[PDB]
From a paper:
The SAH molecule is enveloped in the deep pocket of the SAM-binding domain formed by the helixes αY, αZ, αA, αB, αC, and αD, and the strands β2, β3, and β4. (ii) For the ribose moiety, the carboxyl group of E84 (strand β2) and the imidazole ring of H30 (helix αY) create hydrogen bonds with the two ribose hydroxyls. Upon SAH binding, the guanidine group of R39 moves inwards ∼3.9 Å, forming a hydrogen bond network with the carboxyl group of SAH, the backbone carbonyl of M33 of helix αY, and the carboxyl group of E142. SAH binding appeared to fix the active site residues of TbPRMT6 in conformations that are favorable for substrate binding.
The set of protein arginine methyltransferases (PRMTs) is a family of enzymes that catalyze the transfer of a methyl group from S-adenosyl-L-methionine (SAM) to the guanidino nitrogen of an arginyl residue to produce S-adenosyl-L-homo-cysteine (SAH) and methyl arginyl residues. The overall monomeric structure of TbPRMT6 consists of three parts: a SAM-binding domain (residues 36–181, blue), a dimerization arm (residues 193–225, yellow), and a β-barrel domain (residues 182–192 and residues 230–368, green).
Residue numbers in the entry:
A (entry chain B): 25 to 227, 230 to 368
B (entry chain A): 26 to 227, 230 to 368
């Protein structure tokens, strides 16, 4: 069932394709030393080896680490990949010198060139492992310093962005509920549709939203440089974005349906992320191919939704919002999304 | 919970069986129908569309209140009465009280047909059969009070539990080995065995590939829905004997095993059929998938991997005793136990 979740991630072709391409394009992998943080099945470790890495350290805390040793052996890669079955944090606690002392023969004169990881949670942050990736990065930079090696570590992915967009719920309601319930062998069961829908919204909605829900193409909220981001940043994630709904292609879709006296109402905001390396981008936008992340949608209170308290004339208007991504405890792995309209 | 109801309304097999039985039945038009556990009221509204004189729609949950609106939204309010109550509570009100409250709708003929979708997993588990039995008996008392002794037509009229021995290999191959064998040139097939084995130890409810059958299946338990009583649901067991020497399904695997070979048995799969007139609703692996899927009981992993239950390629005899036993007093929840011999 651990493996069932990993199988989900391995079936994510967009996810798989971004990492395979990024790894094959790095000029820092061949002949150099790679660390894979949170390696799971070891797929990224094994890709790095095939790409000609000198040696790979594959770090995995769970009991998958023991089976990964077997699969590495089954793929004849046991000399190029070392599995470390422990948390990043416990490896760190063992210290810089002890790391170098245990694996010096594999490190040789080279140090760590590349840090591979797939840490992204929902909107990058929620149920992710970014804080462990940051700790790993800082630790291996100290390991490099102790080896007298001064080259900075390549992060893959190297950059991450959070995107936000205002939505109307109508097309999600119509496509996922009303379309089915309105005609059940010629019977009108649409009253049941309103019910099923209203109660599912009172579950942070994590679902693949039809793109027609977008009232605007989306704006950047938070952007990260993965070589420089520090834990401190995860304590104050907030920004204010301004959606120009005038002359927005997305808004016009709905403006045409409203009629000349009609109004288009905002029911909430949907949130997604991109990460990138070199020429490659992995996107979880509703406009991109589906991924196991889907998107995360934050709704306005039902009072605001049903009475359409946030609405716009057919010509559009301006929509400002301040959004907070707030840690709900001290791990910085769990977050809540809070917003206030301008 | 309407999401579970959508799932049942999206089950094309389940829906066509009931739509066809109701629209092809000769006891509905001009007659009085009871829908026991009506939920959305689909079976009731179908009964009204088929020309029923009147329909009593019984639904215990708060769906009943919305069902009234939907009966109205489809212009059927004179033809369908929603009784938002448990079957058991309506019975407790007594016969004479029912007859007096609804005397004009019963008319002179009383209840002719009792519609219901009560089937759980392997017919019994998380099903609603005891309420259907109680309803049937109650409305036959109502009929008797009106001088009608004609027995009530049950839809479905019959139900059968089937069992068949299976091999796990094709399920392993199709749902595990095929994916894990090559992940971009990597052999992750070790992960495949682990995911598979660990999933088996967590009553397997799943769509088994038809190639898993070592035999077409035999009847374990058969019910006449006009006559079945609650007492029967406390002692459900039987013994079936599979002649694998005469099974086409076994011969299939015997050929793949080759002239020198053994065919191994990894467990038993259980499904059900219900029927009415010319129509059968089947949840067999050889039939289109339904939300019931099938239920599979595996032999101990020791037996499976050491192939402790096996047959030479010409076949042999496989006898098994099965118990379907209620795990509490509701007669809604059950476990399946089996012994080879
Ligand atoms: N602090 C930590 N130290 C070591 N492993 C960790 C960790 N936090 C999470 N993990 C592991 O990191 C993995 C992230 S899922 C990523 C799996 C794999 N790299 C892939 O791309 O397919 C999980 O297997 C989890 O067990
Ligand atoms: N003892 C009981 N008395 C009245 N309603 C019951 C009941 N037990 C279960 N129900 C209701 O019966 C329904 C059965 S599932 C819905 C069946 C519906 N006729 C269909 O074929 O789609 C559920 O809505 C449940 O709430």
């Amino acid at each position: 069932s651990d493996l069932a979740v990993h199988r989900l991630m391995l079936e994510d072709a967009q996810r798989m394709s971004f990492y395979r391409k990024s790894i094959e394009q790095s000029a820092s992998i061949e002949g150099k030393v790679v660390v894979d943080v949170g390696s799971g099945t070891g797929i990224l470790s094994m890709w790095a080896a095939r790409a000609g890495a000198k040696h790979v350290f594959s770090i995995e805390a769970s009991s998958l680490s023991e089976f990964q040793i077997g699969v590495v052996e089954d793929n004849d890669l046991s000399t190029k990949i070392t599995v470390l079955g422990d948390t990043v944090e416990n490896i760190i606690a063992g210290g810089v010198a002890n790391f170098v002392n245990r694996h010096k023969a594999k490190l040789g004169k080279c140090g760590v060139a590349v840090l591979l990881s797939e840490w992204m949670g929902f909107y990058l942050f929620h149920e992710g492992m970014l804080p462990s990736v940051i700790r790993a990065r800082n630790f291996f930079q100290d390991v490099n310093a102790a080896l007298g090696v001064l080259q900075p570590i390549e992060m893959i992915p190297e950059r991450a962005t959070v995107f936000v967009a205002p939505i109307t719920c109508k097309p999600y309601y119509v496509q996922r509920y009303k379309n089915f319930w309105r005609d059940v062998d010629g019977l009108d069961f649409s009253r049941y549709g309103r019910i099923e829908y209203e109660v599912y919204l009172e579950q942070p909605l994590v679902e693949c939203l039809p793109p027609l829900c977008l009232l605007h193409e989306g704006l950047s909220l938070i952007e990260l440089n993965l070589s420089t981001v520090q834990e401190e940043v995860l304590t104050s994630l907030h920004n204010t974005v301004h959606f120009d709904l005038k002359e927005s292609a997305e808004f016009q879709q709905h403006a045409r349906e409203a009629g000349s006296e009609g109004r288009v109402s905002v029911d909430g905001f949907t949130v997604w992320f991109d990460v990138s390396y070199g020429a490659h981008t992995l996107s979880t936008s509703p406009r991109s191919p589906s991924t196991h992340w889907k998107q995360t949608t934050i709704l306005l209170p039902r009072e605001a939704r049903n009475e359409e308290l946030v609405s716009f004339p057919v010509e559009g208007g301006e929509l400002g919002v301040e959004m907070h991504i707030s840690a709900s405890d001290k791990t910085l792995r769990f977050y809540t999304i809070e917003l206030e309209l301008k």
